[PDB]
Design an enzyme around this catalytic site. Structure first.
Site, PDB file in Angstrom:
ATOM      1  N   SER A  61      27.189  30.908  24.492  1.00 55.10           N
ATOM      2  CA  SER A  61      27.154  29.862  23.480  1.00 55.10           C
ATOM      3  C   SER A  61      28.372  28.928  23.479  1.00 55.10           C
ATOM      4  O   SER A  61      28.366  27.913  22.794  1.00 55.10           O
ATOM      5  CB  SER A  61      26.923  30.449  22.090  1.00 55.10           C
ATOM      6  OG  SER A  61      25.621  30.991  21.996  1.00 55.10           O
ATOM      7  N   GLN A 117      16.432  32.969  18.673  1.00 60.52           N
ATOM      8  CA  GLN A 117      16.028  32.893  20.073  1.00 60.52           C
ATOM      9  C   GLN A 117      14.718  32.134  20.207  1.00 60.52           C
ATOM     10  O   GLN A 117      13.838  32.249  19.353  1.00 60.52           O
ATOM     11  CB  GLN A 117      15.838  34.308  20.624  1.00 60.52           C
ATOM     12  CG  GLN A 117      17.118  35.140  20.662  1.00 60.52           C
ATOM     13  CD  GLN A 117      17.002  36.466  19.902  1.00 60.52           C
ATOM     14  OE1 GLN A 117      16.384  36.538  18.838  1.00 60.52           O
ATOM     15  NE2 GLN A 117      17.641  37.510  20.434  1.00 60.52           N
ATOM     16  N   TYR A 147      22.967  30.339  12.547  1.00 63.31           N
ATOM     17  CA  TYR A 147      23.297  30.222  13.946  1.00 63.31           C
ATOM     18  C   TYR A 147      22.059  30.542  14.810  1.00 63.31           C
ATOM     19  O   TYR A 147      21.426  31.604  14.644  1.00 63.31           O
ATOM     20  CB  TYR A 147      24.449  31.185  14.172  1.00 63.31           C
ATOM     21  CG  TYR A 147      25.099  31.142  15.501  1.00 63.31           C
ATOM     22  CD1 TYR A 147      24.847  32.148  16.425  1.00 63.31           C
ATOM     23  CD2 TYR A 147      25.988  30.119  15.840  1.00 63.31           C
ATOM     24  CE1 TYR A 147      25.443  32.144  17.655  1.00 63.31           C
ATOM     25  CE2 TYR A 147      26.605  30.111  17.089  1.00 63.31           C
ATOM     26  CZ  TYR A 147      26.316  31.131  17.984  1.00 63.31           C
ATOM     27  OH  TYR A 147      26.886  31.168  19.223  1.00 63.31           O
ATOM     28  N   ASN A 149      19.896  29.474  18.759  1.00 64.96           N
ATOM     29  CA  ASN A 149      19.706  28.803  20.031  1.00 64.96           C
ATOM     30  C   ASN A 149      18.663  27.692  19.954  1.00 64.96           C
ATOM     31  O   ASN A 149      18.811  26.658  20.587  1.00 64.96           O
ATOM     32  CB  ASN A 149      19.221  29.794  21.101  1.00 64.96           C
ATOM     33  CG  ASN A 149      20.261  30.808  21.482  1.00 64.96           C
ATOM     34  OD1 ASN A 149      21.358  30.452  21.885  1.00 64.96           O
ATOM     35  ND2 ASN A 149      19.899  32.078  21.414  1.00 64.96           N
ATOM     36  N   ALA A 310      28.606  34.556  24.268  1.00 66.13           N
ATOM     37  CA  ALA A 310      28.191  35.778  24.927  1.00 66.13           C
ATOM     38  C   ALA A 310      26.894  35.572  25.657  1.00 66.13           C
ATOM     39  O   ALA A 310      26.049  34.790  25.226  1.00 66.13           O
ATOM     40  CB  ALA A 310      28.055  36.926  23.910  1.00 66.13           C
ATOM     41  N   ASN A 335      30.435  41.716  27.572  1.00 66.96           N
ATOM     42  CA  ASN A 335      30.251  41.220  26.225  1.00 66.96           C
ATOM     43  C   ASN A 335      30.847  42.236  25.246  1.00 66.96           C
ATOM     44  O   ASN A 335      30.164  43.171  24.806  1.00 66.96           O
ATOM     45  CB  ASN A 335      28.761  40.970  25.943  1.00 66.96           C
ATOM     46  CG  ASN A 335      28.504  40.523  24.506  1.00 66.96           C
ATOM     47  OD1 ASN A 335      29.428  40.181  23.778  1.00 66.96           O
ATOM     48  ND2 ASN A 335      27.237  40.548  24.093  1.00 66.96           N
TER      49      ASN A 335
END
EC number: 3.5.2.6
Length: 353
Positions: A61, A117, A147, A149, A310, A335
Site C-alpha cells: 500500500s 479487497q 481503509y 484497496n 504490506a 510482513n
C-alpha cells in the site's frame, strides 16, 4: 554514513531484524537532504542472494503514495477535479448509490465503506463495473473512513482516464521518469528479475499475485535508492522542475479529513509534528468517523508524513518530516507488525532531529 547515523540505525535495526526474524532489509535515512543506505540479510534465501541497494521490494500500500501523487498531477493539469462526481469519469456507473460520491471520496477512503479487497473473481472491465454497481454503502459519503484497496484503486484508474494513457504509462511518464525513479516498476521487466527479492510468508517464498486494480492500490516494486529519491521529492516538492508534478506532490500532502490525531492526504497520511509513536499507531477492518477539513490545509511542513505497506511477503514503511529535511524508508521481505516499524522509524528520526 556519519557515525551518529550509522550507530542509531544499526542499534535500532539489528535488534528489529532479530526479534521479527526478517530475512532481508534495506533502510535509507535522509538527513539534511542527503541519503544514507543500509542493507542486511537475504533477498533470496534459497539462492543466497543478498539484499543490495539495487534489490526490488514490493511496496504494498505504500504504492498509494504514487497513486495519490499521480492523481494530484492530473488535478494540477486540469484533467480531473476531486470535487467531480465519480460518474463523470465512469458514466456506465449508473446505480443510484453513486450519487454524491466524488473522486475525493475514492482517494481518501470516505465513499461510504467500499470493500477492503476487490474479490479474486473480479478480473475484467465488465467484472469491475458489475462489482461497483452491486456494492451497497453502509454509510453516506464523507462520514467515515475505511481503509480500502477498492477505493484508492478506483481513484487511480479514473484519474488517468482523461490523459488517454494506461495507468502504468501515465505513472512512468508523469511521475517515475521526471523524478529519475528508473528502477521502480509496476511490472518487473525480465531484465530486472535478478534484483527482485522474494517475500517470505510462513517461511515460504512468495510474490504478490495479479489482481484487479493492483497497479493502482498496491502494485509498485522499488529499490531503496529510488525510495530515498521518492522521499527527497516529497520533502522538497517546490524544487521539482515539472510544474504540475510539483503541485501534485503538494496536493497529496494536503489534509482533507481528520480521524483522531491523523489527517488523510492522497495516499499519504499525516500527523502534526512533534508526535509520539503511541499516537502514530492487526485490525482487519477499522471504521472511523471523519471530520472534513473545509477547505483542506495545504501541505504542513511541521508534519510527520508516512505510510505503511504490506503484501503477503513484504513489509514497508516510509516517514518524513519536511520541516526537518528528515526521512526514512524501511523495506523488508517479511510482513512484520506495523507498530514495530513505526517504533524503529521514530527511534531513528527522533535521535536525528
Amino acid at each position: 554514513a556519519p557515525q551518529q547515523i550509522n550507530d542509531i540505525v544499526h542499534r535500532t535495526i539489528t535488534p528489529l531484524i532479530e526479534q521479527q526474524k526478517i530475512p532481508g532489509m534495506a533502510v535509507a535515512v535522509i538527513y539534511q537532504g542527503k541519503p544514507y543506505y543500509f542493507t542486511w540479510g537475504y533477498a533470496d534465501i534459497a539462492k543466497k542472494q543478498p539484499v543490495t541497494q539495487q534489490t526490488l521490494f514490493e511496496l504494498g500500500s505504500v504504492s498509494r503514495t504514487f497513486t495519490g501523487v499521480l492523481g494530484g498531477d492530473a488535478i494540477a493539469r486540469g484533467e480531473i477535479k476531486l470535487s467531480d462526481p465519480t460518474t463523470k469519469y465512469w458514466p456506465e456507473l449508473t446505480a443510484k448509490q453513486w450519487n454524491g460520491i466524488t473522486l475525493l471520496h475514492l482517494a481518501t477512503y470516505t465513499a461510504g465503506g467500499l470493500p477492503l479487497q476487490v474479490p479474486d473473481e473480479v478480473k475484467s472491465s465488465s467484472d469491475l463495473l458489475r462489482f461497483y454497481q452491486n456494492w451497497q454503502p453502509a454509510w453516506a459519503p464523507g462520514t467515515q473512513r475505511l481503509y480500502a484497496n477498492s477505493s484508492i484503486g478506483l481513484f487511480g484508474a479514473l484519474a488517468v482516464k482523461p490523459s488517454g494513457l494506461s495507468f502504468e504509462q501515465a505513472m512512468q511518464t508523469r511521475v517515475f521518469q521526471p523524478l529519475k525513479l528508473n528502477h521502480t516498476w509496476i511490472n518487473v521487466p525480465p531484465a530486472e528479475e535478478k534484483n527482485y527479492a522474494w517475500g517470505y510468508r510462513e517461511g515460504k517464498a512468495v510474490h504478490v499475485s495479479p489482481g484487479a486494480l493492483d497497479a493502482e492500490a498496491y502494485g509498485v516494486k522499488s529499490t531503496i535508492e529510488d525510495m530515498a529519491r521518492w522521499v527527497q521529492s516529497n520533502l522538497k516538492p517546490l524544487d521539482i522542475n515539472e510544474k504540475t508534478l510539483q503541485q501534485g506532490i503538494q496536493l497529496a500532502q494536503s489534509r482533507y479529513w481528520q480521524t483522531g490525531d491523523m489527517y488523510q492526504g492522497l495516499g499519504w497520511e499525516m500527523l502534526d509534528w512533534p508526535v509520539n509513536p503511541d499516537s502514530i499507531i492487526k485490525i482487519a477492518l477499522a471504521a472511523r468517523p471523519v471530520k472534513a477539513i473545509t477547505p483542506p490545509t495545504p501541505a504542513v511542513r511541521a508534519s510527520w508524513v508516512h505510510k505503511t505497506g504490506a503484501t503477503g511477503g513484504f513489509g514497508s514503511y516510509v516517514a518524513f518530516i519536511p520541516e526537518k529535511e528528515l526521512g526514512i524508508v524501511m523495506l523488508a521481505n517479511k510482513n512484520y507488525p506495523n507498530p514495530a516499524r513505526v517504533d524503529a522509524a521514530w527511534q531513528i528520526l527522533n535521535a536525528l532531529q
